[PDB]
Amino acid sequence: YDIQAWKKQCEELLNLIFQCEDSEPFRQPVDLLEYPDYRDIIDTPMDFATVRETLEAGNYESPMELCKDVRLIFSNSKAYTPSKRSRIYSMSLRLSAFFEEHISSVLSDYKSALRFHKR
Ligand SMILES: O=C(NC1CC1)c1cnn2cccnc12
């Protein structure tokens, strides 16, 4: 029923993601000194600190918008990798599976709560 519950649920999920060793490459914006051609490949950089900051600033209206940004972190990694076997891309796939498994109920509860609100 709670149309606002998704926000704390997303904060707690982001805390789990930061505790996860697989999030290490994605915790802060990609360093262009480390990867000089990154912006030649990636149009819209995204990282978990930016997601957390957007959420804490009150700049997400729904968990769907947060999901879109988290999914962009993973699609950027898939686009930048030269190999399906790279260490960082492999970490992104595990972290994506963990994220999708935990965000499913957040989106479901939010959409259900909003449908109840607008009934
Ligand atoms: O997403 C990647 N890098 C960004 C987060 C730092 C990334 C994916 N595969 N890969 C291989 C070598 C170097 N960096 C990568």
Swiss-Prot record:
Tissue: Expressed in myeloma and epidermoid carcinoma cell lines.
Residue numbers bearing the Phosphoserine modification: 90
Domain Bromo per the UniProt entry, residue ranges: 1-106
Modification Phosphothreonine occurs at: 44
Cellular localisation: Nucleus
Function, as annotated: Probable regulator of the insulin and insulin-like growth factor signaling pathways. Stimulates cell proliferation through regulation of cyclin transcription and has an anti-apoptotic activity through AKT1 phosphorylation and activation. Plays a role in the regulation of cell morphology and cytoskeletal organization.
Medical condition linked: Chung-Jansen syndrome: An autosomal dominant disorder characterized by developmental delay, intellectual disability, autistic features, anxiety, hypotonia, obesity, and dysmorphic features.
Quaternary state and interactors: Interacts with IRS1 and IRS2. Interacts (via bromo domain) with acetylated lysine residues on histone H1.4, histone H3 and H4 (in vitro).
Protein name (record): PH-interacting protein
Source organism (scientific name): Homo sapiens
Gene designation: PHIP
Full protein segment contained here: 1316 to 1434 of 1821
